[PDB]
Subunit: 469 residues, 2 copies
């Protein structure tokens, strides 16, 4: 029973960062899809730092290789300033380390550290710390959050679910029960009929790569933003005093690290406790339906001053590609985009290792043989019937922790190497029983063929009047 | 619950049909017909007998381009790209039918009783009385004073079409034609487009009214809304977009009205309608034309008191945001990806009744009335 207009208020997401569109936006790069292409063996992209990026080197212009979807867009657009999803650490967390810096340290302690009379080193160290606290801390937090192999497994499986490809599709087909419909939020695991997730098949060619690339990007943004919001809403102002004391105690060491990536390595460690990360990772990544992603996509578009009905428009198109092609600010966004592309090509979305090794019926003989006998089960001895629902539950629950290479793109069944673990069926374990069931099924079928019609045999004698060889 | 999601129970029925070949897109010169001037009156009802016949084909005067949906010249580039990309064979129009309960009772009492499945205890017994038409041949001949079977069949089909389409249209005439409702519709359009009077009200109060939203009179005071983007665009595209905005708003209004109706029924009302139908059967069966019977049925099931109680608080305030969300969900369900360049639902609607198939005359009237309010309000 609901008596209210469909829209609701959600303070979790309402935050945006306004900055000028890059000269090197996606739409302004015709061959961007060429570089973005990934092949077998590609390794997960890593964050970058100002140490290896000296200076940023860089509204829409009709390029020579502008593809159809981008060609009409590059034309009908009043592009002045495109807003971006506000991807940031909680405002208080930030307050803690900006008020601590404010230059409070001064130059005397810096000179003590450098052990040299050159002020250039002092200025360089100050700039390193400022850049670290501005961009490299966040990049490190992202790197740790999304790089957990278990967390990457979870992301891969939720993407599998949302785009209905591979093992989830097989389960839906065999089950006769629709499994895509499950939509979740912080583990609540609701169910919605009013949800479309199979409309992405209507697109192909470069129209698909891009579109999916987008959908995955917004999904990652939604994940991170909800994570940050839930963390913020569970802040303790006592933990704030503890953070203040810890920063006071550690600043002496923190101002004495040579690398910038190292500087950020320790700041994240001190500020981002492992227990909190694990608690957030408990059940946070939640199933998202394509419809919700499109609704969020429209939110971003409208709030940013572009009518959703001025033909095609995707937020992922207004963002740079490489780190040295983007202003420091949006470096988190660049990292997110590279991560999204890596996941998209990893998941085969254009199976990853979640389908080919074991869950694939074609590759796994035992699983196929078990499936063939799904319905022809029977045992009364006064149900014991292997129902579709039970086998599908067993198939879905199973996942082999090994043989799932989370470091690079391997795509088993393309390598000429054996599997890490032997393939086994989901419910049935002993192969002898499976052989017996196969034998009884074959005898059943052959008998039915031999006497399906019934046979007429002579009344006086006993020969068959219509024998079939 | 997920924030950017939706699950209601009274705004999603989505009658499905094949796109009429004579739909709005396929008429390139539709813009000229859509033109209206000072000497224009509200669109009028049309009955099945009133129109001689229906023709669905593209017809003459339309020439296929040299390249369901056929590419044509003399049309907005939006239509060109739309036709080049999408050529679906079905669309999920919003449902505007009367509630299933009232329609089922009307049909059972008047046309024919619904035949439930035969439970297996006997067979070959021709107990036609259960499945017999409500009025037999002899009674119809008596009332019609003629043995001509052609007249009996034509009258039967006439009121079958009547109870299937016109009664639905009749209610609508009444419900949207009221001058007071007309004033309220103008006011809500001004509020949602922030034009003139609303702009000066915001200036005087120093508070933008874009955050004013209502639903059955229980205002939610939503703040995430912006209704100033439409001013950027101009031309036939602006007219098309506004004409749509208003058509969808009217569809939502009728849908919520028909939901509040469906909520408030009881078996007492069921028996009341049954008694009224059985006692008046003759005066409905014998009528001069489809307008008379439609009006009589409307009075039977649409008393002025009921209309009155519905109209109050019906035209709830709505945002451009809410509108787009509806449009999005319409196209999503139809099977059409929102990422497609410039797809709107009003394209799949014939302009006027002469070409529409019977079931979609309600949508045709919605679109025509939408155009009339759009032009009269001076959308500029």
């Amino acid at each position: 029973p609901v008596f209210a207009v469909p829209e609701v208020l959600a303070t979790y997401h309402i935050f945006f960062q306004n900055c000028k569109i890059p000269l090197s936006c996606r739409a302004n790069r015709s061959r961007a899809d060429k570089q973005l292409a990934l092949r077998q063996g590609a390794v997960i992209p890593d964050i970058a730092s100002l140490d290896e990026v000296p200076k940023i080197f860089e509204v829409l212009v009709e390029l020579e290789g502008d593809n159809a979807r981008l060609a009409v867009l590059k034309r009908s657009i009043e592009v002045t300033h495109f807003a971006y999803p506000a991807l940031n650490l909680p405002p208080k967390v930030m307050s803690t380390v900006m008020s601590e810096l404010i230059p409070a340290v001064g130059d005397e302690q810096l000179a003590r550290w450098l052990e040299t009379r050159e002020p250039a080193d002092l200025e360089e160290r100050r700039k390193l710390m400022m850049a670290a606290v501005l961009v490299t801390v966040e990049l490190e937090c992202m790197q740790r959050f999304f790089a957990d192999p278990e967390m990457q497994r979870k992301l891969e499986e939720t993407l599998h679910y949302t785009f209905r490809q591979g093992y989830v599709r097989q389960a839906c087909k065999i089950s006769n029960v629709e499994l895509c419909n499950l939509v979740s939020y912080l583990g609540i695991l609701h169910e919605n009929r009013l949800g479309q997730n199979v409309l992405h098949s209507t697109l192909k060619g470069e129209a698909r790569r891009d579109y999916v690339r987008d959908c995955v990007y917004l999904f990652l943004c939604y994940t991170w933003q909800t994570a940050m919001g839930v963390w913020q809403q569970c802040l303790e102002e006592r933990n704030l005093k503890e953070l203040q004391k810890l920063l006071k105690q550690n600043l002496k060491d923190l101002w004495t690290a040579f690398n910038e990536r190292s500087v950020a390595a320790h700041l994240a460690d001190i500020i981002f406790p492992e227990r909190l990360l694990k608690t957030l990772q408990q059940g946070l990544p939640d199933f998202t339906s394509q419809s919700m992603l499109q609704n969020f996509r429209n939110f971003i578009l409208e709030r940013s001053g572009i009518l959703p009905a001025t033909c095609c428009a995707l937020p992922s198109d207004f963002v740079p590609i490489k780190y040295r092609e983007c202003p420091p600010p949006l470096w988190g966004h660049c990292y997110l985009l590279q991560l999204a592309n890596y996941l998209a090509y990893h998941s085969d979305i254009m199976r990853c290792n979640l389908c080919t090794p074991h869950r694939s019926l074609v590759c796994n003989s035992q699983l196929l043989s078990e499936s063939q006998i799904i319905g022809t089960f029977e045992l009364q001895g006064p149900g014991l019937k292997l129902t579709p629902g039970l086998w599908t539950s067993a198939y879905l629950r199973k996942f082999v922790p090994e043989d799932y290479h989370a470091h690079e793109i391997r795509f088993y069944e393309d390598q000429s190497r054996p599997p890490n673990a032997e393939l086994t069926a989901c419910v049935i374990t002993q192969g002898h029983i499976l052989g017996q069931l196969q034998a009884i099924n074959k005898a059943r079928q052959e008998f039915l063929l031999r006497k399906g019609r019934g046979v007429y045999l002579d009344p006086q004698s006993g020969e068959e009047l219509n024998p079939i060889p």
